[PDB]
Structures are given as C-alpha cells and as structure tokens.
Amino acid sequence: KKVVAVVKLQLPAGKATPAPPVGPALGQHGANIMEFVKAFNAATANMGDAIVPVEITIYADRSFTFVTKTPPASYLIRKAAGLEKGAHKPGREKVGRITWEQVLEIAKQKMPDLNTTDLEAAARMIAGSARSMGVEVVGA
Amino acid sequence: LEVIKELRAITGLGLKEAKDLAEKGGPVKEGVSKQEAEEIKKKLEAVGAVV
Amino acid sequence: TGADLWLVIRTMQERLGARPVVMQLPIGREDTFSGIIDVLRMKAYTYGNDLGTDIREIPIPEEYLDQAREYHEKLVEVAADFDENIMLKYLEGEEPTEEELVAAIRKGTIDLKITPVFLGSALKNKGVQLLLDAVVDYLPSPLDIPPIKGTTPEGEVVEIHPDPNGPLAALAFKIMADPYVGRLTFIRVYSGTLTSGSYVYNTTKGRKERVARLLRMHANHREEVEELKAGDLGAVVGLKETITGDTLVGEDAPRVILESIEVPEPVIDVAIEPKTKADQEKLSQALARLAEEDPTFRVSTHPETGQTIISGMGELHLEIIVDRLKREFKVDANVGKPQVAYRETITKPVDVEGKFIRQTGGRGQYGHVKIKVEPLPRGSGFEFVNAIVGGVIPKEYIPAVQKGIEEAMQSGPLIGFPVVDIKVTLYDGSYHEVDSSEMAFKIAGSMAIKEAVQKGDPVILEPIMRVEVTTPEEYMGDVIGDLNARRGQILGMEPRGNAQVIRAFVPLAEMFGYATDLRSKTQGRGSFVMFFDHYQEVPKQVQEKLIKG
Amino acid sequence: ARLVGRALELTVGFSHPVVVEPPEGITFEVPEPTRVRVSGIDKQKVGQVAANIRAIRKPSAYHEKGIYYAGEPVRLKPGKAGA
Amino acid sequence: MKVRASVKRICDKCKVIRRHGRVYVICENPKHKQRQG
RNA sequence: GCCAGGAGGUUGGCUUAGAAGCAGCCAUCCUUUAAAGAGUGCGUAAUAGCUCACUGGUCGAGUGGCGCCGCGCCGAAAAUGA
C-alpha cells in the first residue's frame, strides 16, 4: 500500500534493467522502466539517447508519474571540442579546441543544474573542468 | 474485476471485510493518468470517489 | 530447544518465496508438547504420554482455541482464490465442511501451490497418525500425476497413461548390488503391466531380456508379486546388461523410447597415481561397477601425459567413493593434485643457425637450415610463412622439415614440454639433389628448432581458464574476495537468472576446485563451470622450483 | 536467566547453570530471562562485579552471543578467515 | 606484534601508557598490541 | 564535548571487467558560502555509506604544537646459592 515511494535514478534512453534500486523501491511500485526507455526516447530524440536522472512516484495505491533531468558535462565538452573521449593526464596534453569561444554556448544550453543558479559565476568552474577533461581552453 | 487485477491483496484479503464491504481508493489525474479514470469506472463498475 | 510455528512459516518465503499455508497448531513450546490442535477439522488432538497407546482429544482448555480462529480463518481465504464455490462462500460466512474442503486443498496440494504444514515430533511419537492421515487426505497417487515425459520410436510424443491394459511402456532406474540374489534394479513401470514370468526388451542397448522375478522390498520383510501394475512400482530380479536410467519396453511393446535426460556434471577434479599401478586394473573394473551403476563421475584419462583424470560433482562425493576404495577393492593409491598441461613459448625472434649436412662417402642425405622464427601473443594460435627466396629448397623439402619443427615441438627443450602461440618464418637454406633427403631435412627442422628454443629466451604458460560463478551477493563479496585471491582476474558482471553471476579468468593451477569453497561461503547455492581460454606465464619465478631437474 | 530464590541462575552456552549470590550494597531484579538488572549503591561494586558478569561470559566473537552490559559486537569473518 | 624495544602508533586508536612498569601500546584493533621488551 | 551542513559540475582526467574523494597514475578550477577539501581515514565487487578538514552557534577560561638543559624509564636472557 506504499505511502510515497517516489524514486529517481541514473538511466539514459535505452537501457532497461529493473534491478535494484529499481527492484526494492520501484519494483514495489510496479512502475514501467520499460516504458521509460521507450517513451523517454521520444521526448529526447536529439541523439535518441542521453544520460538523464529519472524519477517515478507511487501514490497511496499505485499511481505513476515519471520525471527527468540533464546529461553530463563530460559530453557537452566532448562532442564539441574534438576530444573524442579521453586525453590522458589532463594537464600536460592540450588536444581539443574549446577555447574562450564555444564555451559560451556549451555553458548556455545547460541552466537548471550546475551549482551557481546563474550563468556568470561557475562558468569558471566550466572553464576549469575542460582542463580536467584534458582539453585546451586556449585564450581567445 | 478490480480485486483480482489492481488490488494486490488477492480477492479475499483486500476485501477481507466483505462481511460489510468497507474499502475505497484508486488514484487518478488529468491528461496522463486517465487510465484509472474511465476504464475502471466505465467497464460496468462503480467507484464514485472523484473521477 | 526452539519449538516453532512462527520462524518456520517465516523461513519458507525467506529462502525461496512461495505461499505456504498451514493446517494445524502446536500446543506450546519446546518440551512443552502434548499434541496438535488442528485448524482443519478444528480439534485438539494429543497423546499426553509421549507414545501413542494412551492418546486423547481432551477438551481444549480455552488457552489458544480463540487464537486458532485467526489462524484457522486463513484457510477459508485461500480457497477464495482457486475454487468456484469459495469465492462466494468466503463472502457468505457459511461453514465449509470437508466436502469441497478436501477437494479445494487437494486441488492446491497437487497443483504445486500449498504447504499444509503438518508436523508433530518423533521419539516423541507426535505427528504419527496425524500425518499418516493427513498424507492420505492430501498426498496424491498416479491419478493426478501427469504423463511422465517419454519419447517415441520415430521422434514425437505420447502420454504415459496408467492404462492397465494397453501399450507396455517401462522404466527402471536403480542398479543395486544385492547379496541374496544379485544385480537388482528398482523400477517404475509407467504403462502396460508385467508378469513375474515374461521377457521385455532393453530399448537403449538391445536385449529382449528375461524378467525372472518381480517383487517389493517391504518393511521388516519382503513381499513378492507375480505381476506389476501400470503406474505402480517395484523391484526386478534379472537383467545383466542395462544401465542406471535406460529406456525400457516390454515384449508386447514395439521398441519405443524414453527421455529423462538429466545432468550429473563433474565439478571437483583430483587425479590418481597408485602404488606401482599394480591395482589400476582392479580399480578400472571397479569403475565398471561404478561409472555405470551410478554414472555420476568421469574417468577421463589424462588428455595429455601419464596420469588418468577422475572427475566428479561434489567433493566428499569423491571421498565416499575413495572410501569404497580401501574396503571392497582394498587398493592403495595417491590421489594427487593434477600436474600441469604444459606448453612453452618465447618473446623474442632470432636468426638461428641449424645444421645436418652430413654424409661420409657414397650416400648423401644433407640437412642445412638457416631459419628465422617469431612467436605470437598468448592464446591466438599457430601459423607460419613460406619465405622462399627464389625456390631454394622446393619439392619434398617443405612439409617433412616443417614436421621437423613439430617433432622438436612435442618435447620443449627445458623439460620436454610443448610450445604454442607462434609464427615461425625461416628464410634460407642449402642442400643437394641426390645428396639430400626427406628425414634429413626433417631433422634439419628438429635441430634448428631445438637451438631456436634453448638459446632464445625460455618461458612456459600455465593453463588459464574462464568461469561463471552462479551466486547470491553477500558471498558475491566473499567469493570475489578469494577469486582475486587466486592469482587472476575475473572480468564479468551481469545480474543473472535469480541473482548475480560473475565471469572470471582464473588459472587452474591456482583455480583448481572451488565447489568445496563455493559451498563454504554460499552455504550451497549455485556453482561454477570450467571454460578454457589458453595459458599465461607463472610470474617468471614460480617456475624455478618447477625447473627441478 | 532466572530470579529464582533471590539470585542469579542462568545458562549462556554452558551446560552447568551459573549461580550468583548478591553481596551487601545491592538488591536483585530479573524481568524477562533475556535481560537482567541489579539495583545497588557503589560505583566500585557497580563496574567491578558487572564486568565480572561480562566475565561470566565473553561477548560476540565472530558473530554475536554472550553478555554485554550494553556493549556492541564487531564481526570477524567466519566463513573463511581461518585457512 | 607483542614485545619489542621500539613501539609506535599507526592509527589514532594507537596510544602509549605507563602502568606497573614499562611502556604499553594499545589500539582499537588489539592486533596492534605491543610492549617494550 | 554538542545540533548542522559537511555540497555540485565530478563518477575530475585516465585506465579499467567496473575503479565513483577514495587501487592507482596525471593531477591545483570554481561555484549556493557561515561552510565543505578535484577530499582524511574507514567502507562496497566498484556505488551507497561512517567520516574528518571547513563553519556558525551552544559555552566558559585558557589551550594545543615546536626548539631547548638536567635526573629517572625501557632496550636487559645462563648454567653451585646470593
């Protein structure tokens, strides 16, 4: 009779395996994580798939309601810097190309996440992580 | 038709008190959760609680 | 000390997960036992005295009677989910007497969905008549028993009807060494009939086979029969061939077949080397009494060198049969840890110089070899190249000399152990038509290779393996613990059937036998399987006490 | 663990019953034979005799059985370790 | 690792005390037990 | 000594069966700030998790570390009885 078991997770479009914590929290909810990977692929049809936190709510009986969020920055820099995945030793090697330029767009389209609840502050957090991910944030 | 499908507690456990029928429930919404609106109250059933 | 009800009816669905449902009530705790107050026919039975010759039904002194209600009322509720009377009858409130009661519960009982826990005791003769009668009341016979899957003499299906009249369909199973008469097999018929004066026909390895005597091993004594019912069971005197679980037909029966495949795969494997092998043959014919009466184990001879391999499921399994050893057979032995299926290799290619250009005067046979070689990563395979620099040594001077390589391969230079994962590549040589030959170039190869291994950086690899550990998770932590602690690396993570199953590179020489361990941790839930990938080196130094010679 | 007579009668893994008689400065109490209380007056005799109870039986060890005034059990792997 | 002329601490459970004589080394895991012998 | 956060990109990069501050190597950014360390030890199969550094209070008078000179301490077990 589950009194509120609203449970989120970490699942990209197209990866349906209802094992714990989907089992002991959403298995006792009977929520459709199968319908997740199916219909979540619809609202997110930009590349078909992307890492995004789900969230399914149960309501005194069995009502369902799923909610979603955003992809990881280690992909926002990746497929926009020419850094295909990794770089090794993110400080010594400067491979990519995200300078002072396209970082404006990359940091732009992501708003309801990060930490600073604005875009004029943790853009240096952005400007540093690109280094942490082995990319040259060369001056412009 | 409601107790052997939606109500998990079999047919005699959720309605244990079928000695004097004392059980109500079943959520609903607007737009999405219209599966529990009229398809559980349209199939010759009768739970007049909300919608 | 720990009488129950509670913890038991808990430790049903907290071990597997299935609706139990109970049908009585234990009066009191440990050593506080009288009898059982059944929540079936609804009565407090007991013995008073431990035995069962001064029993009673003595009035339930209130105590738990009322309590029983809740317990007992459970009964009704269950029958509201299977019957066609008791949905509406739980609705009504009327008394369900043992009319449709026994039918609903028998239904569920043979339906594989019910666990009418009757219990009692033992030395405390409690639960004797209780479960005698309960067993008659709900434990079934071949009426409800479904057609035990068997096959047809063309490749299709049929039903193993009781059918006391028609098709003589038969099975036996238990090969037993009996003293009074001999090899007796315990049997379940299935269809037809059979007289204690008839033949049959073995329908695995043919023989129309005289059935000498039909009988039953019965309590303190034994009851003999002249015939045997189709569906009933028994024991048979006769049958010299036959195996443990071979398809059976009768005379009248038209050579049909049977199924029941079953799998008694081996898991713990330890190898044998006796005194001076003067008993090896005695124990081989022993294995005729053994790997046949109970085909459990395997006698797979060493697929390599000298030391027969005898594999089997369980561990103490092996022990009890190694106890059958020094009794009936009375043979002495040394069940050693298996040796090492061995193949060497190298890491470096060299321009080696091999010779055999020898004669005397009046009989040729030369063998020169300017060879070059190169190995290959562990577990890829073995090929080579031509390296003809114009066709210097054509015709008969190709495969035999290559076999020179092979005949230098069957005895790897360090301690006479093979070499793999290689890719050769010669390049130059000499000869003379009438003054060279086949085997000459064969030993050209052998020689060339021999130096091209001894003076070319030595190393051996140890038989690596892969494995699927089928298991829970508590001891997923435990097992991964000792798994990595067996020198190698796992690689394998997927949530399998009931729980979780780990895939693992393992080394055999340090992975040998995990069942004894598997049960030690995981109590006894789900085992592992011996896959073969190839072999890797033994950390460059372990092989120093091993080059002992 | 029983309040029979006036004093301690308890089995904790042993076969032979453990009896303990109260000195002056304490009174006895046993509610349910799975937890026991003494009611007395001396912080010396408190811990000396009570740790003498923890000495009536050594605690935990691998899992959990024995006497703890209100202490705690720490696990030391039983399904392996000793090999 | 009981008894030795030098005695030291690894974790903050490990400590040193005087009682009835020489040095004594303790810790939460009494696996770190020593003495100065 | 207590309540309280002890965060987020970040699961840093990378390798890797997976490596999430935490096996490891390369490694320094900033952000909601009073305050959180590309994270101190513990912990998991790797997450999850206890954590502490940080910080505010509660609270009341001292406190913790380093360098120095003396004396004692251990390191210390033999063959007749001291």
Print the SS3 string covering E1-37.
CCCCCCCCCCCCCCEEEECCCCEEEECCCHHHCCCCC
Gap from C474 CA to chain D (nearest CA, Å): 11
Backbone angles phi, psi at D49, to 5 degrees: -75, -30
Q: How crowded is residue C250: how many other Cβ atoms within 10 Å of its Cβ?
A: 25
CA distance C185 to C214: 10
DSSP string, C141-177: -TTT------B-SSS-B------SSS--EE-EEEEEE
Beta partners for residue C193, in sequence order: C229
Using a CB-CB cut-off of 8 Å, the residues of chain D touching C471 are none
Instruction: Say which residues have a Cβ less than 8 Å from residue D27's Cβ, sequence separation at least 6.
Output: D38, D39, D40
Nearest to C424 by CA among C479, C350, C510: C350
Nearest to C297 by CA among C274, C315, C313: C313
Beta partners for residue D28, in sequence order: D38
Q: Please tell me which residue lies nearest to nucleotide F17, judged from CA to C1'.
A: C491
DSSP string, C121-140: -SSS-TTHHHHHHHHHHH--
Number of helices (H), then strands (E), in chain C: 11, 22
CA-CA-CA-CA torsion for C76, C81, C87, C93, nearest 10 degrees?
Answer: 10
Q: Can chain E be said to touch chain A, i.e. do they have 3 or more Cβ pairs within 8 angstroms?
A: no
Gap from B10 CA to chain C (nearest CA, Å): 7
Distance A105 CA to F24 C1' (A): 35
Using a CB-CB cut-off of 8 Å, the residues of chain B touching C91 are 18
Return the exposure string of A75-93: e unless at least 16 CB atoms fall within 10 Å of the residue's CB, then b. Answer: ebbbebbebeeebeebeee
CA distance D40 to C188: 74
CA distance D22 to C475: 47
Kindly determine whether residue D80 and residue C475, on different chains, have CB atoms separated by under 8 Å: no
Residues of B with CB under 8 A from a CB of C: 10-13, 16, 18-19
Tell me whether residue A6 is exposed, middle or buried, using C-beta atoms within 10 angstroms of its C-beta: 0 to 12, 13 to 18, 19 or more: middle
Gap from A48 CA to chain B (nearest CA, Å): 23
Distance A112 CA to F22 C1' (A): 29
Kindly determine whether residue B12 and residue C93, on different chains, have CB atoms separated by under 8 Å: no
Q: Which residue of B has its CA nearest to C93?
A: B19
**Amino acid of residue C314:** G
Backbone angles phi, psi at C517, to 5 degrees: -75, -50
Q: Can chain A be said to touch chain D, i.e. do they have 3 or more Cβ pairs within 8 angstroms?
A: no
With H, G, I as helix, E, B as strand and everything else as coil, classify residue C448: helix
Experimental method: X-ray
With CA of A129 and C1' of each nucleotide, the nearest comes out as F29
Distance A134 CA to F19 C1' (A): 19
> Distance of CA C215 to CAs B48, C196, C218, C228, E25, Å?
71, 8, 9, 8, 78
In Å, how far from its chain's centre is CA C2? Answer: 36
Q: Please tell me which residue lies nearest to nucleotide F15, judged from CA to C1'.
A: A88
Kindly determine whether residue A63 and residue B25, on different chains, have CB atoms separated by under 8 Å: no
CA distance B39 to B49: 14
DSSP string, C199-214: EEEETTTTB--EEEEE
Take residue C10 and report the two structure tokens written for it.
Answer: 């808990």
CA distance C399 to C442: 8
Nearest to C460 by CA among C324, C332, C339, C364: C339
Residues of A with CB under 8 A from a CB of B: 59-65
With H, G, I as helix, E, B as strand and everything else as coil, classify residue A56: strand
DSSP string, C202-258: ETTTTB--EEEEEEEEETTEEEEESEEEBTB-EEEEE-SS--TT--EEESSS-S---
Neighbours of C (≥3 Cβ pairs closer than 8 A)?
A: B, D
CA distance D53 to D57: 7
CA distance C342 to B10: 63
Which of B36, B47, B50 is the best mutation test for A, with the most CBs of A within 10 A? B36
Using a CB-CB cut-off of 8 Å, the residues of chain C touching B16 are 77
Distance E22 CA to F81 C1' (A): 30
CA distance C419 to C411: 8
Among B13, B16, B19, beta carbon nearest to C93? B19
With CA of A134 and C1' of each nucleotide, the nearest comes out as F13
Instruction: Say which residues have a Cβ less than 8 Å from residue C519's Cβ, sequence separation at least 6.
Output: none
Residue for token digits 């935990």?
D60
**Please, are residues C268 and C196 in contact by the beta-carbon 8 Å criterion?**
no
Give C67-97 as a 3 state SS string: HHHHHHHHHHHHHCCCCCCHHHHHHHCCCCC
CA distance D56 to D52: 6
Kindly determine whether residue C91 and residue B18, on different chains, have CB atoms separated by under 8 Å: yes
Residue for token digits 């990359």?
A106
**Amino acid of residue C515:** A
**Please, are residues C117 and C23 in contact by the beta-carbon 8 Å criterion?**
yes
Using a CB-CB cut-off of 8 Å, the residues of chain C touching B10 are 77, 80-81
DSSP string, B1-51: --TTTT-SSTTTTTTTTTTTT--------SSS--TTTTTSSSSS----S--
Gap from B19 CA to chain C (nearest CA, Å): 7
Interchain contact D79–C (C-beta under 8 A): yes
Nearest to C201 by CA among C210, C192, C191, C193: C210
Which of B3, B33, B40, B50 is the best mutation test for A, with the most CBs of A within 10 A? B33
> Distance of CA C466 to CAs C340, C486, C493, C530, C532, Å?
17, 13, 13, 6, 6
CA distance D23 to D52: 13
Q: Which residue of D has its CA nearest to C517?
A: D80
Interchain contact D80–C (C-beta under 8 A): yes
Q: Please tell me which residue lies nearest to nucleotide F11, judged from CA to C1'.
A: A72
Element (H, E) at C535: strand C531-537
CA distance C259 to C230: 18
Nearest to A33 by CA among A45, A18, A44, A48: A18
Determine if the peptide bond prior to A21 is cis (ω within 30°).
Answer: yes
Distance A55 CA to F4 C1' (A): 28
> Distance of CA C191 to CAs A110, C177, C197, Å?
75, 26, 17
Gap from B26 CA to chain A (nearest CA, Å): 6
**Amino acid of residue C182:** G
Gap from C95 CA to chain B (nearest CA, Å): 14
Query: What Å resolution does this PDB entry report?
Result: 3.8
Pairing of strands E23-26, E15-18: antiparallel
Pairing of strands D26-29, A7-8: unpaired
Pairing of strands C268-271, C309-312: antiparallel
